[PDB]
Every structure is written in C-alpha cells, then in structure tokens.
Design a protein around this nucleic acid. Structure first.
Ligand SMILES: [K+]
Ligand SMILES: [K+]
Ligand SMILES: [K+]
Ligand SMILES: [K+]
Ligand SMILES: [K+]
Ligand SMILES: [K+]
Ligand SMILES: [K+]
Ligand SMILES: [K+]
Ligand SMILES: [K+]
Ligand SMILES: [K+]
Ligand SMILES: [K+]
Ligand SMILES: [K+]
Ligand SMILES: [K+]
Ligand SMILES: [K+]
Ligand SMILES: [K+]
Ligand SMILES: [K+]
Ligand SMILES: [Mg+2]
Ligand SMILES: [Mg+2]
Ligand SMILES: [Mg+2]
Ligand SMILES: [Mg+2]
Ligand SMILES: [Mg+2]
Ligand SMILES: [Mg+2]
Ligand SMILES: [Mg+2]
Ligand SMILES: [Mg+2]
Ligand SMILES: [Mg+2]
Ligand SMILES: [Mg+2]
Ligand SMILES: [Mg+2]
Ligand SMILES: [Mg+2]
Ligand SMILES: [Mg+2]
Ligand SMILES: [Mg+2]
Lengths: 134, 87, 81, 200, 80
RNA sequence: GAGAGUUUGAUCCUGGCUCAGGACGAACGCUGGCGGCGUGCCUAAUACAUGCAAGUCGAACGCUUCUUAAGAGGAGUGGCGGACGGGUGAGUAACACGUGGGUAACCUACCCAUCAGAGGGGGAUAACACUUGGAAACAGGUGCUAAUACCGCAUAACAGUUUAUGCCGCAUGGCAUAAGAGUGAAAGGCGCUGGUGUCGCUGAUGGAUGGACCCGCGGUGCAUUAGCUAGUUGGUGAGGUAACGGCUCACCAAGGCCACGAUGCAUAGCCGACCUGAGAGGGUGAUCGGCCACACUGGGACUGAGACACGGCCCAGACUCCUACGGGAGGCAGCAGUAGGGAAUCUUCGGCAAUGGACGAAAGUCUGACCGAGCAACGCCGCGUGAGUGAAGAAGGUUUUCGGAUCGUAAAACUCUGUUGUUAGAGAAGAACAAGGACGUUAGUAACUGAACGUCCCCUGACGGUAUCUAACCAGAAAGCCACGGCUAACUACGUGCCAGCAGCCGCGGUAAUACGUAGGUGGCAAGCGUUGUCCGGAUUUAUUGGGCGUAAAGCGAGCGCAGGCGGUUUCUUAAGUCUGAUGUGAAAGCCCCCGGCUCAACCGGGGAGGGUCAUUGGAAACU
C-alpha cells in the first residue's frame, strides 16, 4: 500500500485466541457474571467419568471426565497416567493442554492434587502424575 | 512549613540518609523539594556531604531543620554562618 | 464519633455554626435594610450605608466571609449609594 | 550447588583432560556409559557448541547461572575479542588463581581451600571462591593454615607456573602480574564456539 | 513580562456577535509512517466589534476565559 | 538480526500450524541445607469477632480527688491537630494523567522577614451544686464560676476603591506617587528587674510552601455506533465565587460540536517505570515514587487557612446489633486477624532506640507511619552437601558376540578441611540527640534573666547477646527434578502387544518399541527441577524499518468525478516543514557509564549520561 493508504487505514494485526479458554474466565457469584481472569489451573467437579474413542489413526479407550469448573463452564478433560480413582462428584484440578487424539478435550486433570490420586507404581517422571518418591 | 530533614535510604539494617528540603506534610521517603546533602551514620566519624550555600539559602527563606539535621549543620558550622547572616 | 477529639469537635463546631449563622444573618439584614431604603428613596440612606459597610467589615473580621467578598460587597454598596 | 561426582567421567565426556595431566583420558578414552566404547554417530553443530560451553564451565567447576552471568560481563567489556575476555575473567576467578599459584593440585582442591577460608587476599580472609581477583592483588595462605601438609605438598609438586603469575614459595603469596594471554590460556578450547552458543 | 500563545488562522464563523471562530490549520507527522498530515484546530475568539468576517486571516492571542468556549482575543486582520 | 519440524511418489514456491529463547506479585507436581536482599489477596470496592491505627497542651482558664502545703490524678472550657501520615482503585475516555506554557482572573494555617498596633469595657456559659425525664443512648431545669472563650466601644487604611499625575503592557489593563469618601483588630501567659526577656495576640506587605483555574500537544476498541446539543453556543445585564467563566439567573439572538470521528456503546485509574525485541516496535501499569479518585450505598452541608472530611456531623437506603418497643448503635479499601470466593498469597508479634509527623517552652505524651522480628524456595544473589592419593579396574547392578564391556578412581582403603554443622566462649556500629549541668561570643538593655550562636560534661538500643570474631570435635547430619525417535545434548535391555498408554508438532503402540511401563546407563540443570497460565521473540504471520495482488489469498465490471494525496522548468522572497546553536525543563528512584561500601555478588551509596515528534530564543536556505 501507499503511505497515504496506510495513513488512511493503518495496519491491523490478527487477534490470537487461547487454546484453553475455560482457564481465562472467572465467575462472580454475587453479580452472577463471568470475569476475565487468567488462571494457571482451575478447580472443577467431575460431572461424568468414562472413556472415549480416539480419532481414526489411533485406537484406544482414552480415559476422560466431563467437568464443570468453578466458573460454571463445562469442559472435557483428559486423565493421564495408568489407573485412577476419580468418580462423578469428585473434586479435581484442571490444567491447560490439548489431546491430539481426542476431538474435544482441551484440559488435563492434574494428578496428585485434590481428589486425584497419584498413579500407582509410577517411578519415572514422578512429578508429573503426582506420585511421591518411594 | 518547609523542613530540612533526613530522607532514609539504603537497605535493611544499613541505613543511609539524604538531607533534603521538603514540606513537613509530605511522606518521609515521598515528595521532597530538593536534596541538599547526605548523611551516613554508619561511619565511625559520621560522614556528611552538604551543599552549605543551598542549605543557608533555605534557612534564610525560613526552613526549619529537624533536630538531627540541626546537629549536622552545627558540626559543619552552617548554623553559625546563618546566625551571623541574621545579624 | 468513636474518638474523644471527634466528639469535642462536634460540639464546638456546632456552637461555631450557631454563632456564625447568627452574625452572617445580621450582616445580611443590614445590607437588606440599606438596599430597601435605596429602593424606597428614604432619608436615612447615608446612615444605613455606613451601617452596611460597618457590618460587612465586621463580618470580614471574625472570618465569616473572605476579604475579597467583603471588598466586592463594599463596592456593590458604594455603587448603590 | 557444587559438583562432586567423578572427575574422570566428566573429562572423558568432554573429550579433553580437565586436570591437564591426561590421566583420565589415557585409559579408556571413551565417553562415559555403556555405549561409549563402541563407535558413535557424529555430533551436530549444536552438540559441538554445547560441548565447548561445557568444557569451560566444567574446567572451572561453575554452575550454568553463574557461568551465564559471567559471560554477559565479558560481553560488556569493550576492547578485545569477546571470547578472549570471557576466558580472562574465568582465570581471574579466585579459585583459579589459587590453582595457578599451585597452592592446590586441582581446582576442586583450590576451591575447598578458599571455601574453608585458608586463603586471604591482601591479608584479609575471603571465603568466596567466586571472588574476582584483580591484577596485583596478593593471594596468600592464612597464617594458621600455612602448616598443613596439603598446601605444602602442592607447592613443592607444582613445577610450572604460567608467565603471568608470580609466586613466592616461603611467603606462599602470589599475584597475577598481567592478564593472561590467549595462547597462555587453554588452546584446545575454542572460545568462538562458546560465544556462538550463548548467542543462541 | 511572560507571553501568551498567539496563533494565525482563518475565520470560519461570525454568525455570533462579539465572537469569531478561527482555524489554525497545522500539519503533524503520523507517528508510525511519518507523513505530514493536515490537522485543523479551531478556536472561539472574542471579537470586540465583529470586525472580522468569514474567510479572513487573523491573529489571536490566548486570554483568560471570556465565556464557556472563548479563550482567545482577536488582534489583527491581515487578509479579507 | 542463527533457525528447525510438518502439504508431495519426489521437487520448487506459497502458506498456516508447532518447537528451540526470555520473562512472572504466578499457581500446581516432585524434591528440599543455609545465608543476604527483596516480594507476598492479581479473585469479592465481598461481610467482618477481637485488640490497636489521633491525640496533645496545667507556661490559656476555672474546678475536683489523694501524698504530709507536696507531687500524682480526675473530668471542664479553650488552643492546635484531626484535610498529614496509612489503605484501595470502585469510578473515571476526563485538562484525570504526561509534557510544555499561561494567570494583568486567584487563594494559602503553621515557617521566615519588614512595618505598625497591642486601648478601653461589658454580658455570658460550661465545669460545679442540686434537680426533671430515660431501659440505654443521652437530653433538659434552677443557681453560681474563669479564661488566650464570647460581644461592644475607641484608635489603625499600609487593604480595597475613586480621582489626578508619571511610567509601562497583551485587550481587559500593570506599577509607583498624591489626594480623597466610607468603615474595619487585638490576649494575655511564663520570667527577670514602672522597665524588661521570651512565647503568644492584631493589621498590612514580601518570601517560601501548599492549593486553585485556563491552555497547546500525547497516550484504548467499535461506523454491523452519524448525527449530537437547548444553558445548549454567543451577547447585555444581574447575582455568586479565593478567582475567570452560562458558574447561576432575566432578557436578546440561533448558535455550538461532528467523517481531522461528534454522540453512543465497551473497556480502563494515568505516569516515572517494568518484560520482550537487533531496532522499529509489542505487552504490562505489582512492589518503589508522583498525580488523581474513592472510604457500606446515595445525597448535604457544618467547622476550618485548608474537607463537602477513611477512623467527623445531618438525611435516605441495604445490612448487623441493643431495646423496657418509646427509641438507640455501627461501617477494616488503617495494622494484624476471621469467614467467604479462589489455582493462589503472611503474625491477631517488639519498639518508639533511629528517620519522620501532631501537640507542648521543654521534659515529655501519641504515632500498627516507620523501624525490627515472625511465616512462604515466591524471586534474585552467595556458599555447601567434602578435598587429595587411590586398580588393566573389588564386590554387586546392568549388559554380553559369554571373551568381555559399563556403572568406575567411582567405591573400598589411606592422608587432609571445617565453608557449614555441634559445642562453648568474646561481641558491635546503627546514638545524632533533646533536656539538664557548665561556661564563652554576638545583638539588645540602665541592668538583668533571657534570645541566637559557639565549646565541654551528662544522658538514651525494640532489633539483641543480633551480625560478627575466636577456639574444640566430626565426612560426619545436608540432592533432587526432568529429559534421552527427529526437531534436541543424551541408548540399551526386558515387560507390553493399535492393549495399556505417550504426545508441543511430526507422530509412536498390530509379539524383536532407542517414542509406551520398568530397569541400567547417559544428557540438562541444580536447591531446585518440570507442567500449566500470560506477554514478547522467533512471525517479513499487518512488512514505516520490512511483504504482496497474470496462474498460489489478493485489481472494484467500467467510467465521471467532490474532498483528499501527489505534482513540470525557473528568478526573487518567506521561513511553516527541514537542519543547527544557546537557554529552561523532561523530579527522585530504576536502566546504562564511571567511582565507591557491604569478605564476593545480589544489594547499597556518589557522580554522570540518556530520555521530548517539548517551550523560548539565534542562525542556514538546498529541498517541501
Ligand atoms: K481538646
Ligand atoms: K505429514
Ligand atoms: K513452513
Ligand atoms: K485542624
Ligand atoms: K496540560
Ligand atoms: K453572560
Ligand atoms: K480504576
Ligand atoms: K462518592
Ligand atoms: K478522620
Ligand atoms: K519516634
Ligand atoms: K494510643
Ligand atoms: K534522636
Ligand atoms: K521424544
Ligand atoms: K512496506
Ligand atoms: K479490470
Ligand atoms: K523554515
Ligand atoms: Mg514421558
Ligand atoms: Mg558513630
Ligand atoms: Mg543459586
Ligand atoms: Mg484488591
Ligand atoms: Mg476499574
Ligand atoms: Mg479571642
Ligand atoms: Mg523482530
Ligand atoms: Mg475503618
Ligand atoms: Mg564455623
Ligand atoms: Mg541428538
Ligand atoms: Mg520409554
Ligand atoms: Mg512481527
Ligand atoms: Mg485457482
Ligand atoms: Mg486466485
């Protein structure tokens, strides 16, 4: 564009959007609205727990939970590690992170936090999966 | 009224002071009108750096040194100069 | 008030308001009497003019009005006279 | 944090002798681990640059954070080649000065001496191995410490002192007459690779 | 004595008595691209006798507030 | 000024996506030795138990209770303070803020300096005593009492104003002189000897300080928001204010703003600064400092130099609490702390010793400011978790091509060190002081006390027996986390069999997996490590620096054209742009440069530089 063209209509950049939107919004019980708060994690209650089929390339029974977060937004989160103790009405903590295999999972359930028990027999990468040092 | 007083500086347990002309109502470390010297009590002979001419001018304008600053100005002899200037 | 000095100031400020309102109303009545005399074309206008100026200055004393307000009123009264 | 693990394993991983004796490399000059003895694929350019960076920091027994800050200071120096200046500062580090003077056989030993405070700079105790030693500052052993077998043995054993260091045996006092020259420093290490590494 | 800002401009409204509207017509560099762009500031100046007409080049000096929007006083009329 | 992976059978180009860096008031997972310095409700401007955060003055005044007439209290009146300091940022898109000007349209207690005055009288009321009502909160009645409380009268016009001169400015006008009309004030206390010192009191002026108003320019999004305005725009008067002003009001007009974005909607405290970047820029607006705004919500004024007042008053409302049902009390966004929300943020601690602030003549009293200490690896910095010698290399683990390789000089063993740790001892600076005791010099006096200044003695530490130093003993109590298919430094065994599972992208897993789990090794870093969240970079991926539009996304179907953008040669001139100098300013702190202090560093201190599309002013005239 000419300089006059840019002056008349300046450059405008694309606006990015979060890969983990549910973590970006808080809730104000009094006003009953959603706030704009960036949170590294968020507490939610497991409304449902089960397993899901991956996308076409892969085959498994990926373990997941449908969770209503503390800001009333309902999302689907993955459950990493081998074996878990979660059930519906179990209080969990959620972190960002997609799952390539699964269609609509954008969050991970942190292990070792709140009602999520560490992974039994985990011995390498213990920080992740939330297991104490044996 | 206008004050000549010590603004504290330095670190915890290691104070330093700047002799500054400031309005009495202002916070100690807050707004001040001008810096006129420094004062380091941690030296065995307490070390003082002073703009004697500026301090005398402010005293003539009616600044009121705090107690410690008055001792400092006396030790530097500024107070006697101010007394003679009044004469 | 939760502070003893606050309670003390409540009483004293109330009393000062009583006194100040009384004196200010007195000054206004003096000015009002002179203005009405000017309107009516009375004979004691000059005596009332002196009284109005006297009242305004005495009101400036005691700090019921600012000195600038007092001078503005004096000029206004002088123009009326 | 201070590294304490085996010394030979680190030296042979780097492929050069940290102590300079070559004793570590002489026998089994393989990278540590079970795959070391057998042939290994060539290293990428990033690996080469990383290896040079590791060479310097393992030589002087420093952590990455302190190493990184020191490199930045070297950059601030205006005159002379950047990598050369960085190596000069590495030398001026207090531990290395003790090592060069030969009051300790190894840099670990010199560091422990400084940490325990047996050394004094200009007659003043200094327990900071990281301490920066200027040209002309006199590094000496604490008077109480002078009669300990370790430092005395190290002095008698060390027979070659770099030109830039000046040392007195009886007083056990040394100092850098001048900043070390590039060739006086370790030549096997290539400072340009380290410079480019931190350029990232 | 300190000086008040005086501006040159062109009258654009005289339908109000004892006052005129002037336009300064400056240019400013665009912050990003730096081209000079025409910028128009207009002032309401008090006219003592409605001398100045529309489309007249006049000078105005800043003054104390004379009305809600007046802040300037007419000085000269250089072109009609 | 570093790139890399991924479209294909393969290739080049285009293009998006993803990664390698840094940062944080972070949180979470595992782990966890210490010290220095700093930081710690980002969410509910949600509600708040409890304790404290604003008092002081007896040398303004009159009372009242005790100690053998003392000192110590107790409540009055009166003075100053309470408008500072501390908290939060809700609101606010606005001269709120930033920067630079203007005010001849301004005010200012306490502090300095100058010139004057400081005379005469008077009536009160608290307190007190009784006494009415009330459940309480608290209101009343009667009778006394003082003041530096209150009111008159006297004198003061230098204030303001008019006039007349002289000078000057930027229109209104400013300054000085003279004259003139009308009126305006005050308080005494302590102490020397009627005089007098000192602190007070009154008027005028000037200074400093603080505040106030106006103005140029600068910094959010949305036009799938285009009309807005009726005291609105201006005038004439009048009133009001510290002051200009539609600030308000009566008349007179119909004007004012707006595509150079009005208005409306949404979001937001602004800045110095901070993070990133090669830079241009992008993001942020914690801690620290400046300004602004707010104090349960809404409104109002009173006192005052100063408030429309966080810990003041009045009214209304929501909520909490007390009632004897008549009526009352309250406001943590002060310091701690509690509940609640949340992923998530601390002790209901010590002291006024230092610096600062209020009152006092001063001792001193008050100060949750502020000094410290406490808790959190939350961050940065610093030091350890030993050092030296030590085998063709012990056992065991792992792995074997069964020979052997690797963990590995690592261990063991021997010789040394105590940073730390434990134990004992010794031990700061931070303290200047004020008052008080002595003298001495100035000015003033007749003389003194006394004032200002000067020199000695005396006097005080919460931190705290804290830092630190010395000496004895012991390798003894003190290393984890993640990663190892490529990007990417780091590889083999089992177990598993498109399962269990991994994953940032490519993608791994279907019985021989360096990609899953475990193991052994190895790499990275280290009292941290990693994950998530968010910002910048890489991203030339909005390209001003720095991209494109024949076929990859992209030339309107074409023209006529208002505004706008741009514009042929040349003489002279101008100096808006442009270049350049000087001056002023762009606070302090923080970056950056020198120089110092902490054993180093972090940190702290000193001196510089920088930082503006800045204002004033002087130059140049090529280009616009
Ligand atoms: K009082
Ligand atoms: K592919
Ligand atoms: K690509
Ligand atoms: K006050
Ligand atoms: K401005
Ligand atoms: K008007
Ligand atoms: K705000
Ligand atoms: K309000
Ligand atoms: K208050
Ligand atoms: K104090
Ligand atoms: K108190
Ligand atoms: K003191
Ligand atoms: K991998
Ligand atoms: K371009
Ligand atoms: K075409
Ligand atoms: K020009
Ligand atoms: Mg893994
Ligand atoms: Mg001292
Ligand atoms: Mg560290
Ligand atoms: Mg808050
Ligand atoms: Mg807000
Ligand atoms: Mg009085
Ligand atoms: Mg860039
Ligand atoms: Mg409060
Ligand atoms: Mg010790
Ligand atoms: Mg590799
Ligand atoms: Mg694996
Ligand atoms: Mg870019
Ligand atoms: Mg096509
Ligand atoms: Mg096409």
């Amino acid at each position: 564009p000419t300089i006059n063209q840019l002056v008349r209509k300046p450059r405008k950049s694309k606006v990015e959007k979060s890969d983990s939107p549910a973590l970006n919004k808080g809730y104000n019980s009094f006003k009953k609205t959603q706030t704009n708060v960036n949170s590294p994690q968020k507490r939610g209650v497991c409304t449902r727990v089960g397993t899901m089929t991956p996308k076409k390339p892969n085959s498994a029974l990926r373990k997941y939970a449908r969770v209503r977060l503390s800001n009333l937004i309902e999302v689907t989160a993955y459950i990493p590690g081998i074996g878990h103790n979660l059930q519906e009405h179990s209080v969990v903590l959620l972190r960002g992170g997609r799952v390539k295999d699964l269609p609509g999972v954008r969050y991970h359930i942190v292990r070792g936090a709140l009602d999520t028990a560490g992974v039994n027999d985990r011995k390498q990468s213990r920080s992740k999966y939330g297991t104490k040092r044996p | 009224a206008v004050k000549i007083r010590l603004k504290r500086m330095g670190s915890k347990k290691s104070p330093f002071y700047r002799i500054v002309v400031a309005d009495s109502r202002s916070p100690r470390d807050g707004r001040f009108i001008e810096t006129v010297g420094t004062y380091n009590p941690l030296k065995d002979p307490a070390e003082v750096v002073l703009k004697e001419d500026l301090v005398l001018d402010w005293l003539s304008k009616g600044a009121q040194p705090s107690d410690t600053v008055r001792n400092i100005l006396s030790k530097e002899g500024v107070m006697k100069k101010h007394h003679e200037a009044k004469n | 008030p939760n502070i003893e000095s606050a309670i003390k100031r409540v009483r004293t400020s109330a009393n000062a308001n009583a006194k100040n309102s009384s004196q200010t109303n007195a000054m206004r009545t003096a000015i009002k009497k002179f203005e009405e005399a000017v309107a009516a074309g009375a004979d004691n206008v000059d005596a009332l003019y002196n009284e109005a100026v006297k009242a305004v200055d005495m009101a400036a004393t005691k700090g019921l009005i600012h000195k600038n307000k007092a001078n503005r009123d004096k000029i206004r009264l002088s123009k009326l006279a | 944090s201070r590294y304490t693990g085996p010394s030979w394993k680190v030296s042979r991983r780097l492929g050069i002798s940290l102590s300079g004796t070559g004793k570590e490399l002489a026998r089994r000059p393989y990278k540590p681990g079970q795959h070391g003895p057998n042939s290994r694929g060539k290293v990428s350019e990033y690996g080469m640059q990383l290896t040079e960076k590791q060479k310097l920091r393992h030589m002087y027994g420093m952590n990455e954070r302190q190493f990184r800050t020191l490199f930045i200071k070297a950059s601030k120096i205006k005159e002379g080649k950047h990598g050369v200046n960085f190596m000069v500062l590495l030398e001026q580090r207090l531990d290395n000065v003790v090592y060069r003077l030969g009051l300790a056989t190894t840099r670990r030993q010199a560091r422990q001496l400084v940490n325990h405070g047996h050394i004094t700079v200009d007659g003043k105790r200094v327990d900071i191995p990281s301490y920066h030693v200027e040209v002309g500052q006199v590094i000496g052993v604490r008077e109480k410490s002078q009669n300990i077998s370790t430092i005395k043995e190290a002095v008698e054993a060390t027979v070659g002192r770099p030109a830039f260091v000046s040392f007195d045996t009886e007083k056990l006092e040394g100092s850098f007459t001048r900043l070390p020259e590039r060739d006086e420093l370790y030549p096997e290490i290539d400072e340009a690779l380290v410079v480019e590494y931190y350029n990232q | 004595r300190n000086q008040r800002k005086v501006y040159q401009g062109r009258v654009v409204s005289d339908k109000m008595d004892k006052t005129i509207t002037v336009v300064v017509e400056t240019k400013k560099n665009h912050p990003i691209y730096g081209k000079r762009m025409k910028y128009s500031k207009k002032y309401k100046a008090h006219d003592e006798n409605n001398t100045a007409k529309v489309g007249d080049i006049v000078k105005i000096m800043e003054t104390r507030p004379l009305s809600a929007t007046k802040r300037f006083r007419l000085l000269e009329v250089v072109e009609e």
